[PDB]
Amino acid sequence: HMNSILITGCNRGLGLGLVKALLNLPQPPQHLFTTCRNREQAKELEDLAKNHSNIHILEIDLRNFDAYDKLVADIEGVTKDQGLNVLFNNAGIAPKSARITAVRSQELLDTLQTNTVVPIMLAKACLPLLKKAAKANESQPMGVGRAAIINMSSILGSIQGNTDGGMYAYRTSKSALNAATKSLSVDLYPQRIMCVSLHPGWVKTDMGGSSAPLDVPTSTGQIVQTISKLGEKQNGGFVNYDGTPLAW
C-alpha cells in the first residue's frame, strides 16, 4: 500500500491512466498528488478531483526549478511526518521524428531538460520527503510501500536494443534518465529508497499514437500492479510494464 504518491503530468495519457488505476485499487493512496500545467484544462483530472478527495492537484511547469521548493512545501504540509512514499516522474516529451540531417540543437536541449534534468531535480527536491517515508516504514522491505522513485523511461532508451536509429533527442534523454536511475539507486540505498526506470510498453496516447498495441488502462493497470510488486532485487533496474528486466 502506498500512503502517498506524487505523479507528474496527469491531465493526459499515462499520467491520467495511472491516477485512475491507483483509485481502482482496493486500498487506494490516502494522498495522491498530481501535477499539471493548466488546472483550468485537465477537466477530466479536475473532475476526478471533485469526486475523489484523496486526489490533490498541484499546478506547476516542471521547467521552473525555483518553483520546486514550494511544491515540496505543500506536500510536506499534508503528509508531515509520514513523508512521500513515491515520486513517479511521468512528465515527458517526444519531438517529431527527424533524420540526423535535420536535427536541431534546441530540440535536443529542450528534450534533455524535460526528460532528464527535471526528473533528477525533482528527485533531489523530494529527497527529504522520501527519506522520512523510508524511515517511517523502516520495518518494511524495499518497495512502493516504503519509499521509491519510479522514472518513466522508454524501450527506445535501450541502447543495446536500438536497431532502428534516429530519434536523437528522445533516445539520448531516456538513456540519460536510465543512467540517473542507476546512480540514484546506489546513492539512496543507505535510506533504502528504491529507484527504477520503467517502460510502460507501447501505449496509444498522443505520444504513443494509434498504432500502439496497448491501451491506457491495460498498461497503467499492469504498471500500478508491477510497481506494487517491485522489491530490492529490482532496485536500480530497467523493467518492462509487466516487470520483465530490460537491457540498458
Added chain:
Amino acid sequence: HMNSILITGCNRGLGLGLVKALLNLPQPPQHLFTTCRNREQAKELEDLAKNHSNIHILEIDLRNFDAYDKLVADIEGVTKDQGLNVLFNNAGIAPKSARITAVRSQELLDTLQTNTVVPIMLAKACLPLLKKAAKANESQPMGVGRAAIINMSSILGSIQGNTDGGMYAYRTSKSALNAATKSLSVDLYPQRIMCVSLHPGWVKTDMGGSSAPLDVPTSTGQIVQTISKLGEKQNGGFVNYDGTPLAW
C-alpha cells in the same frame, strides 16, 4: 591510413596526446585539423603546428552552433573531393564531484550541452564531408581509412557497470553520447560510415587526475592504434582503449 581527421579539444589532455600519436605514425594524416578555443594559448599545439604543416589549427568554441557552417567550409576547401575521413569528438567537460543533494540544474544542462549536444551537432555538420570520404574510398572496408565518427565516451557512461553512483551530469551525458553513437551507426550504415564510442581508459589529465593508472602517450598511443583496427564488426559499439567491448 587516415588522409584527413578532425579532432576537437587538442590544446590539452587526450586531444593533444592524440595529435602527437597521429604524427608518430609511419604514414601520418595529410590533413590533421585541430580545434581549440584560444589559439593564443595552446602554445604546445601552436608549436607543433609551426613544426608540422599537416596540422591545421581551427579556432572555435563548440557551443557556438552557428559557427559550424564555417568550420566545415574551411575543411572542405582544404580536402575538397576527398572529404573528411574521421571526426573525433574529443572535447568534453566533467564538473566537480557532487552528491545528489547538491546537484545544480545548470551544471546538468551545461554538461549535457558540451558532452552530448555538441558531438551530435558536429556529426551533423560533418556528414557531407564524411560521406564524400566514404564514397571516395567505397572500395575499402569500413574503418578510419574510409569514414568514421569516434565519440570519446567514458566507462562512467556504462550504466550496467555503474556501482558507485553520483556524477549525475557526467554520467548522463556520456550515456546519452553512447545512445547517439548507436543511432548514428544505424543511420549512417548506408554510406558505410563507422561510429563508435571509445573509453580512453583512466588517464592522468586535468580531468583524469594524478591517480589515473595510464599516462597520455600510453592511452593515446593505443587509441590511435585501436581506432586504426576498428572495422564493421565493431560498428555502433562501445570499446575500451585497447578495443575490448564494453557494456552500455
